[PDB]
Design an enzyme around this catalytic site. Sequence first.
Site: not given
Ligand SMILES: *Cc1cc2c(cc1C)nc1c(=O)[nH]c(=O)nc-1n2C[C@H](O)[C@H](O)[C@H](O)COP(=O)(O)OP(=O)(O)OC[C@H]1O[C@@H](n2cnc3c(N)ncnc32)[C@H](O)[C@@H]1O
Ligand SMILES: O=C([O-])CC(=O)C(=O)O
Lengths: 238, 588, 129, 113
Positions: B119, B405, B286, B19, B15-16, B354, B221, B240, B252, B242, B399, B254-255
């Site tokens: 806007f 995102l 990066r 998802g 549910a990310g 990261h 997982d 990558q 983390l 960070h 990346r 922000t960049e």
């Molecule tokens: C860690 C981080 C990453 C990040 C960021 C800041 C931080 C502290 N800032 C970003 C930014 O400004 N710009 C950007 O483009 N990316 C940035 N990132 C990275 C980004 O957050 C991630 O790439 C992205 O969030 C990944 O999203 P995704 O939807 O692919 O993954 P998720 O959000 O981690 O959610 C995963 C979901 O799956 C469920 N899950 C996992 N395992 C299971 C199992 N076994 N069964 C059921 N569900 C499962 C999770 O619970 C979750 O909902």
């Molecule tokens: O993952 C990225 O895109 C970089 C990011 O969030 C940050 O610098 O806060």
Amino acid sequence: MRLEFSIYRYNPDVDDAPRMQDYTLEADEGRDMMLLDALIQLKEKDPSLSFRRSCREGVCGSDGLNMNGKNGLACITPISALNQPGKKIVIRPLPGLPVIRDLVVDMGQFYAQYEKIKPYLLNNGQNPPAREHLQMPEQREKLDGLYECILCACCSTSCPSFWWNPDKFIGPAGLLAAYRFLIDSRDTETDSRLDGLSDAFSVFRCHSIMNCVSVCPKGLNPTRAIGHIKSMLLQRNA
Amino acid sequence: MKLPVREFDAVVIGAGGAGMRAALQISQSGQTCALLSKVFPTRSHTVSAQGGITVALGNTHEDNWEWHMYDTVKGSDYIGDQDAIEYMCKTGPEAILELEHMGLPFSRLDDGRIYQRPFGGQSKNFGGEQAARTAAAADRTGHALLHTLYQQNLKNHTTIFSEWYALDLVKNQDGAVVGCTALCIETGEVVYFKARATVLATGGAGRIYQSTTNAHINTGDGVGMAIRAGVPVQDMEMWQFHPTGIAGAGVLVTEGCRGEGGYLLNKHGERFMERYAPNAKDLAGRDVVARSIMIEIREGRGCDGPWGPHAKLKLDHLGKEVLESRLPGILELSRTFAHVDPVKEPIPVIPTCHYMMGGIPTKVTGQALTVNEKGEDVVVPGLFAVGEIACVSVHGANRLGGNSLLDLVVFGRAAGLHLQESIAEQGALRDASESDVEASLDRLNRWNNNRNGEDPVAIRKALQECMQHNFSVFREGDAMAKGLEQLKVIRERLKNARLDDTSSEFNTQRVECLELDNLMETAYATAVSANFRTESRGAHSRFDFPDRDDENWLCHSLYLPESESMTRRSVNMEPKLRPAFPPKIRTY
Amino acid sequence: MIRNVKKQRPVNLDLQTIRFPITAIASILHRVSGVITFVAVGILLWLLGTSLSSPEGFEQASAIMGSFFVKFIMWGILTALAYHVVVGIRHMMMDFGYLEETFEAGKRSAKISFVITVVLSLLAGVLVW
Amino acid sequence: SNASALGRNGVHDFILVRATAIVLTLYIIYMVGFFATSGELTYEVWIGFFASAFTKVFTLLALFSILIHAWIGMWQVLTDYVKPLALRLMLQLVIVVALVVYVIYGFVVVWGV
Ligand SMILES: *Cc1cc2c(cc1C)nc1c(=O)[nH]c(=O)nc-1n2C[C@H](O)[C@H](O)[C@H](O)COP(=O)(O)OP(=O)(O)OC[C@H]1O[C@@H](n2cnc3c(N)ncnc32)[C@H](O)[C@@H]1O
Ligand SMILES: O=C([O-])CC(=O)C(=O)O
Ligand SMILES: CCCCCCCCCCCCCCC(O)O[C@H](COC(O)CCCCC)COP(=O)(O)OC[C@H](O)COP(=O)(O)OC[C@@H](COC(O)CCCCCCCCCCCC)O[C@H](O)CCCCCCCCCCCCCC
Ligand code: HEM
Ligand SMILES: COC1=C(OC)C(=O)C(C/C=C(\C)CCC=C(C)C)=C(C)C1=O
Ligand code: SF4
Ligand code: F3S
Ligand code: FES
Ligand SMILES: [Ca+2]
Ligand SMILES: [Ca+2]
């Protein structure tokens, strides 16, 4: 130093009634750690101990717990703020909500009220923008303090009105979210939204107790938000 | 036949950000779909995202998606597919404005101290882009994006199975993926979710290190399920780190800081990033900016203190206002974890784990691929992947900031928009004998009967440690060698690991253990890959092979699983597109 | 557990277990002050009834007020009543806008209120006497 | 529209409580101002204060405002603590009667002076 903890325990299949279990986690007196840190350690000593956690940085809303009589996020409640020589650290589940196990409560009724208020944009579609919608900084400013809610329910959990009417009175978090859409320039169903909150419970069960403001991790003020909703109602129904 | 079943025309595991964008799109198509999650959807790692979304909108200044391609291709090191990146950058705008029409709290433009414009979504200057193309909504763009999307699945009444743990995929006699099995964390019952399409979106798994920006949930997982099922992983060594993680915290920052005008300095008062990347400054890519600071620590010239060898991220110079209006989320994480108000003092930052660029190889439509006997790409019936768990080959070996995102939404939506068509293609898929189903329950049964085994905390700790040392920013043959062996040691160890809690009502341990196996298979694949590659590209830096192998290593290393049987390693690549593009010199 | 259906989840609701802000105390007392007053009017009406019925009546009332035990009750009523008016006004003021809805501004409002209440309570007691 | 609640809806109850609160505050000051300017109260002074059209009309305006006010208030309290339907309705009934009697008795006492 040493650390004496007092933790709420309950397992439907072993226990038939709650109990408070003693815990000692001898930690390094080097620096201060969050309460989540403690808990994680303690969980190593005792596996059965369950609780929720994730982002670990006060941004997911998972670790809402009542610490020494006050609700907060275990991930950012320093052990400094909770340690008093001779006395134990009482950690319990969020008040009012049902307990699934240990410190994990069923958040059901909480999300429910959230849904009742329609947590999403409603735009009749009349007057489509070329690309994005017209939102001047002054208009977008109005959303500050209203879109940062992380659904931790520390606030609602701390509201007696919400204890007596879990499903009738919306509660702090939900009204804060109702307001987020009521004052959103992009939303076109404001008057319709206000008619849906004019009953006797949805909003008016709020007595300005301000426990919700007291405990918000994000420093949000539902009381103030609810005060503006009340005004809008007065303007539209008087 | 004693196991319960839930039939859906689709199952979206995760549910990310990606998802939900897919579960939404798949539902708009009148397709019955179940969405699963380990935590309540709003708690997924995406909520933590800051920086913003880099997309060419043209608000901050005129722009074209192509500049987004060049900025990104050279950003990957010509290791990222032109076909996929093209599609993403091109389809970027439309997809983002879509989110604003959904009510996303973007920042706005018009009046500012010395600025002024309409806007539009505010676009901030970011790393890897010549100018400001990052649509940002304060320091909490992920939180805004994740909540909006949830609010949307609320409106469109998406079927959500909150706090369910997916175990292993279930294979078809013909070797196809036909749904999967999962555990209801709440009650503890196990169920088989049968589906004509099984979408994985389980995020990354930076938890295989001791200091990561990720959450306690990112345990790969997904990766674990893919391998234990028979599916490979591309560029699983490309990680990558960070540049500005928080020293001692791993949290983390922000960049965008550098984007708003933040300094990355050394104790001797010089801006070493200016000296390393003489004309691009702190905007440098990066992979590059990481080694710069990390290096100053090797030479004993890195700042130190209670937090540890860090580098000063000076921001105080900017107005306290700008910091509060643009980086509110930063000003707190620093005080909360770094005990330092950025309004008056720099931040103890350091390159920490990261984004995980590696993951399940897929086409633009999100379908999962495996190699043929000859070594040809062969789609996997009933399986798709989107998000970080997927290597569609977009970020390649580095990346670009704010593209993940943008990845989530585009390809999350892409899978949705194409689902019905793909199913048509694969055709009908046959049932699964209790044998197939039973198979997936193996990992569970193991843990539940074994109680005198070994304590998983040590196994877990070891695992992260080794990865931390032997597979850090800089690495070398001898290193990988030892770790790669250590791992086998541990992977056997993990086979006798025990489970103390055998309860039903919310068993955090059982869940965490299950996650351990994934940590194990994940870290493993990471190693066998890391070692394999003979060049220093993007995030990969070997002192033994300081230059990138244009002729030999200009490909996608394919980790070859066989479930728990012995492993293998192969290759892959993608130069063709529409507007054309050549490799080159990478000077940031 | 209804008939042939079991287990109802527990709830954390031990009030001695929860720590309440001064603002939370202010308002619950306003509530308690209202119910006391609700009953209070009846007692005052009764007295007012006697007081005007006739001279012998005014006497009988003047004497009942004589009892010091009655003096104590007539005192709690006026105090409860005063409390209720003060907090009630604090209340109406936040609603409209003569008081900040901020927590701090709220604790300060609550404190000034109890203070004015005690003072009035004192005045009330001088009168009862 | 809850049958026990006086107000047709919530906003109504809000207003009626606030409006009566203001009226009753004036009346209290009025009665207080009188007692704090009496010292030794004589039967002549007491009956003199009430034989006044003004004191009669205000005293009955307060009683009537109490009905509306305490009705809504007592109603809110009961809505929170008395969950058994049958019991709560009995109370609201006892309370609304008591309130109605307060006003009627008020009339009787007033025209009798
Ligand atoms: C860690 C981080 C990453 C990040 C960021 C800041 C931080 C502290 N800032 C970003 C930014 O400004 N710009 C950007 O483009 N990316 C940035 N990132 C990275 C980004 O957050 C991630 O790439 C992205 O969030 C990944 O999203 P995704 O939807 O692919 O993954 P998720 O959000 O981690 O959610 C995963 C979901 O799956 C469920 N899950 C996992 N395992 C299971 C199992 N076994 N069964 C059921 N569900 C499962 C999770 O619970 C979750 O909902
Ligand atoms: O993952 C990225 O895109 C970089 C990011 O969030 C940050 O610098 O806060
Ligand atoms: C801004 C917010 C506004 C605040 C609102 C809150 C109001 C509640 C708080 C009450 C505060 C009262 C304050 C009184 C006061 O100020 O006392 C003053 C004291 O001032 C000082 O000390 C000076 C200090 C200055 C410092 C700067 C004056 O007091 P005195 O000196 O006269 O002392 C009495 C004397 O000993 C000489 O005493 P006595 O011998 O004359 O007494 C005789 C005794 C018996 O007489 C009888 O038998 C007649 C009884 C008649 C009762 C009538 C009740 C009417 C009910 C109406 C109901 C309508 C619905 O008399 C009693 O002791 C008198 C008792 C009076 C009770 C008055 C209460 C009225 C409530 C009315 C509104 C009710 C509303 C119901 C909803
Ligand atoms: C006739 C004497 C009075 C009685 C019997 C009375 C009774 C009550 C009751 C029973 C409540 C509801 C309890 C609660 O839900 O907290 C209440 C609330 C209230 N009263 Fe009074 N009251 C009286 C006089 C006044 C006066 C004179 C004022 C004006 C200062 C006032 C202002 C308020 C306010 C503002 C509330 C709202 C509290 C809330 O919504 O929680 N009251 N009253
Ligand atoms: C404004 O704050 C509060 C309330 O109001 C909504 C309450 O209801 C309660 C709960 C009260 C109980 C169980 C007893 C009620 C007693 C009487 C005499 C009316 C508490 C703790 C409170 O803090
Ligand atoms: S407003 Fe604050 S306390 Fe209430 S649910 Fe949201 S974050 Fe939690
Ligand atoms: S505590 Fe509850 S009563 Fe109102 S002021 Fe906050 S929502
Ligand atoms: S773990 Fe997310 S805020 Fe505490
Ligand atoms: Ca509107
Ligand atoms: Ca990836």
